[PDB]
Amino acid sequence: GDRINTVRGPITISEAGFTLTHEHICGSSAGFLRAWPEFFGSRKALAEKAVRGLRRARAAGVRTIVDVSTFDLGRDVSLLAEVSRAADVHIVAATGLWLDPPLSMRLRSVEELTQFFLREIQYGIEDTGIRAGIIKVATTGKVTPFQELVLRAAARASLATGVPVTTHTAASQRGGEQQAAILESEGLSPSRVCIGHSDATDDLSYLTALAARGYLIGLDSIPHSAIGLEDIRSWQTRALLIKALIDQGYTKQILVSNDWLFGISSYVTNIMDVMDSGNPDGMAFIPLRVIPFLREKGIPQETLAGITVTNPARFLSPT
Amino acid sequence: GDRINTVRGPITISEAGFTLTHEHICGSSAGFLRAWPEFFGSRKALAEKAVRGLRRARAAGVRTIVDVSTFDLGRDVSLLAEVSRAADVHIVAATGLWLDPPLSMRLRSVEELTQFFLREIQYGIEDTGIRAGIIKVATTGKVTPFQELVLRAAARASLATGVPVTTHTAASQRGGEQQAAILESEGLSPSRVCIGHSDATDDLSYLTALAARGYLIGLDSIPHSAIGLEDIRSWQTRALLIKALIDQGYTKQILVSNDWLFGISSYVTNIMDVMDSGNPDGMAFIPLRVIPFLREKGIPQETLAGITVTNPARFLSPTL
Ligand SMILES: C[As](C)(=O)[O-]
Ligand SMILES: C[As](C)(=O)[O-]
Ligand SMILES: [Zn+2]
Ligand SMILES: [Zn+2]
Ligand SMILES: [Zn+2]
Ligand SMILES: [Zn+2]
Numbered sequence: 146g147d148r149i150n151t152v153r154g155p156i157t158i159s160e161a162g163f164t165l166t167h168e169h170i171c172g173s174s175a176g177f178l179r180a181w182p183e184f185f186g187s188r189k190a191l192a193e194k195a196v197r198g199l200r201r202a203r204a205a206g207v208r209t210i211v212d213v214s215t216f217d218l219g220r221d222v223s224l225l226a227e228v229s230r231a232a233d234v235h236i237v238a239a240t241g242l243w244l245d246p247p248l249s250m251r252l253r254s255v256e257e258l259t260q261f262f263l264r265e266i267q268y269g270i271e272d273t274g275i276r277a278g279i280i281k282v283a284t285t286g287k288v289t290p291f292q293e294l295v296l297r298a299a300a301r302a303s304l305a306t307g308v309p310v311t312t313h314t315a316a317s318q319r320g321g322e323q324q325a326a327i328l329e330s331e332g333l334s335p336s337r338v339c340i341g342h343s344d345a346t347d348d349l350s351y352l353t354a355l356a357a358r359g360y361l362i363g364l365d366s367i368p369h370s371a372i373g374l375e376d377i378r379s380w381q382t383r384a385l386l387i388k389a390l391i392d393q394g395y396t397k398q399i400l401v402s403n404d405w406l407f408g409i410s411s412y413v414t415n416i417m418d419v420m421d422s423g424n425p426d427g428m429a430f431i432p433l434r435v436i437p438f439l440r441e442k443g444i445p446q447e448t449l450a451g452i453t454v455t456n457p458a459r460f461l462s463p464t
Numbered sequence: 465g466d467r468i469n470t471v472r473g474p475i476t477i478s479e480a481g482f483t484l485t486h487e488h489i490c491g492s493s494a495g496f497l498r499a500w501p502e503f504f505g506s507r508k509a510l511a512e513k514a515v516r517g518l519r520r521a522r523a524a525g526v527r528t529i530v531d532v533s534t535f536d537l538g539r540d541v542s543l544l545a546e547v548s549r550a551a552d553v554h555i556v557a558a559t560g561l562w563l564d565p566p567l568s569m570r571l572r573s574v575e576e577l578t579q580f581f582l583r584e585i586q587y588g589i590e591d592t593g594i595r596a597g598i599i600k601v602a603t604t605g606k607v608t609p610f611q612e613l614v615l616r617a618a619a620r621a622s623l624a625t626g627v628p629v630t631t632h633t634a635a636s637q638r639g640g641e642q643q644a645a646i647l648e649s650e651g652l653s654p655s656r657v658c659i660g661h662s663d664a665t666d667d668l669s670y671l672t673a674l675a676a677r678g679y680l681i682g683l684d685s686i687p688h689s690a691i692g693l694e695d696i697r698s699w700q701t702r703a704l705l706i707k708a709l710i711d712q713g714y715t716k717q718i719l720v721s722n723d724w725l726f727g728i729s730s731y732v733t734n735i736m737d738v739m740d741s742g743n744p745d746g747m748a749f750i751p752l753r754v755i756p757f758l759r760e761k762g763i764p765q766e767t768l769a770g771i772t773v774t775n776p777a778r779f780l781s782p783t784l
Contacts, residue, residue, distance in 0.1 A: 175495030
C-alpha cells in the first residue's frame with residue numbers, strides 16, 4: 146500500500162518521515178476525558194500542553210507519531226486531530242483493546258471484536274470519519290482467554306486490511322512468545338507485528354529470537370528509566386539494546402519510541418509531574434538524547450535513519 | 465428543595481407524577497454507544513425503540529423515569545434528552561458508579577470521586593449542562609475497598625446537595641446491611657437512601673429491619689422474575705413483597721420499578737430479545753400488571769398513589 150491513515154487523512158509513505166511508533170496524547174479510559182476534563186485541568190489545557198510538546202518534538206526532527214491509545218485507553222480521536230493540526234505533526238490512530246476492556250467489550254465474541262476493529266479501520270472511529278492505521282493489543286504475560294480473542298480478532302483484521310499489529314507486553318514474563326504463537330496460528334506474518342515494551346528487560350536471547358522470526362521489536366519506553374529519581378536501570382542501558390540488536394544483524398527489526406504522554410488518568414494522581422520532572426524532553430527524548438548517544442557509540446547515520454524512518458514506513462504501510 | 469433536575473431542565477415536584485425510580489434507556493459501558501452504535505443496530509434504531517417504549521409507559525400513566533445509568537453503564541445523557549423530548553416523559557439522570565468502573569475511576573481517591581459526583585450534580589454531565597438528580601452506587605455482597613470509597617463519596621455528594629442515593633445490591637447476600645453501615649458512618653440520613661434490587665429476596669426480616677431505620681426499599685426489578693434467569697420465583701411473589709411491607713407498616717418506605725432497558729451491551733449478545741420476549745410490557749409492566757394485581761389483593765388506590773407518586777417525589781426532592 147502507498148498510503149497511511151492519519152487523523153488528518155491519508156498520507157503517502159514518504160511523508161511519514163521520522164516516526165515515533167509508540168506514543169500517546171493521553172492515557173485514560175473510555176468516556177473519561179469528556180466526562181471529567183478538569184481532571185486534566187481542562188480539555189483546553191491538555192490540548193495546549195500536547196501541542197507545545199509535539200511542536201518541540203517536531204523541532205527536534207519528529208514528523209509522525211503513532212498514538213497507540215485504544216478505545217479502553219480513552220482515545221479521543223477528535224483531540225488527536227486538533228493537536229495534530231496545531232502542531233503540524235502526523236498522528237496515526239489505533240484500534241484494538243488494551244488491558245481495561247469494559248463489560249461491553251469483555252463479553253464479545255472473536256467475530257464481534259473483529260467487526261469492531263474493522264469498523265475503526267475501514268469506516269471510521271466513532272462518528273468522526275477518522276480511520277485507524279494500526280491495531281493495538283495488550284496481554285499480561287500469561288494470555289487470558291479474552292486477550293486471546295483480542296489477538297485473534299486483531300490478526301483477522303490485519304489480514305483483511307493490511308494494517309499492522311502492535312503489542313503491550315509485561316517486563317519479565319517474555320510475553321511476546323505467547324502473543325506470537327497465537328498470531329501465527331491465525332496466519333499473520335510476523336512482519337506485520339511489533340512486540341512492544343521490549344526494552345523492559347535485557348534478555349537479548351528473547352529479543353533476537355523474535356527478531357530472527359521477522360517480528361518488529363519495540364524498544365519503545367527508553368526514557369521511562371528517567372522517571373524515577375535514580376533508577377537502578379538507566380536509560381542508557383535501555384538504549385544499548387538498540388546497539389545490541391544492530392550488532393546481531395537485526396537493524397531492520399528495530400522500532401524506537403518514548404511511550405510518552407501529555408496527560409494520564411490511568412494511573413494514580415500526580416504521576417504526570419514526576420514523569421515530566423524526570424524527562425523534561427518528553428517525546429523529544431529519542432531525537433535529542435538517544436540518537437546522539439548511539440551516534441557517539443559509532444552507529445552510522447544511515448543505520449539511525451533506517452531505524453527511525455525506513456522501518457516505521459515498512460511497518461505502517463498496509464501490506 | 466422544590467425542584468428536581470431532569471434531562472430537559474428543572475421541574476417542580478408536582479410535575480413528576482407517577483415516577484419509575486429505577487430504569488435505564490440503555491445498559492452499556494462508557495464510550496461504547498458512540499464507538500459501536502451498530503451493536504444496537506444503529507443509534508437511531510435504539511433511540512426510536514426507546515421513544516416507543518416511553519410513549520407506551522406514558523400511556524400507562526408514567527410521567528417520569530429515573531435513569532440510574534452511571535458513567536460506567538455507558539449513560540449517554542444526549543440520548544436521554546432526545547428520547548425524553550420525543551416521548552414527553554421526564555427523565556432524571558444519575559451520577560455515581562456501578563460495577564464496571566474503568567481504571568481511571570478505580571485509581572481515584574474518595575476526595576476525587578466526590579468532586580466527580582459533585583460536578584455531575586452541580587455543573588453538568590460532560591459538556592451538556594444536564595445535571596444529575598440522583599447518585600447511583602453498586603456493591604457486591606461484602607463491600608470491596610473501592611466500593612466503600614464510592615459509597616463514602618456518594619454520601620458526601622448527597623450531603624452537599626440534598627440529592628438522594630440509590631443502590632444496587634445482591635439481596636440474597638443481604639447487601640443492604642453493609643451499605644447502610646457505611647452510609648450512616650458518613651452522617652447520611654437513611655431517608656435519603658434507596659436500597660435497591662430488594663425484591664430479589666423473600667427475607668422479610670432483612671427488608672423490614674432496613675425499613676425500620678428509615679431506608680427506602682427498592683422493589684425495582686419485578687418483571688425480572690417473569691424472565692427465565694435470576695430465580696424460580698414468580699413476578700407475583702415479588703409483587704407480594706409490596707403488600708408485605710404495606711402490612712408491616714412501611715408504605716412510606718416503598719419504591720417500585722421495572723429495572724427495564726431498551727438496549728443492552730453489558731451482557732451476552734441478544735439478551736435483549738430474551739428479555740423482551742419474557743416481558744413484552746417493558747416499562748409498562750408496573751402500571752399494567754403490578755398495580756392491578758395489588759388492587760386485586762385489596763390495596764386501595766390512595767395507597768398505590770402514595771407509593772408511585774408521593775414516595776418518589778419525597779425521595780427525589782433535594783433535602784437537607
Ligand atoms: C498506556 As502503557 C503504560 O501500557 O504504554
Ligand atoms: C444495570 As442492573 C442489571 O444492575 O439494574
Ligand atoms: Zn503498554
Ligand atoms: Zn503505551
Ligand atoms: Zn443494578
Ligand atoms: Zn438497574
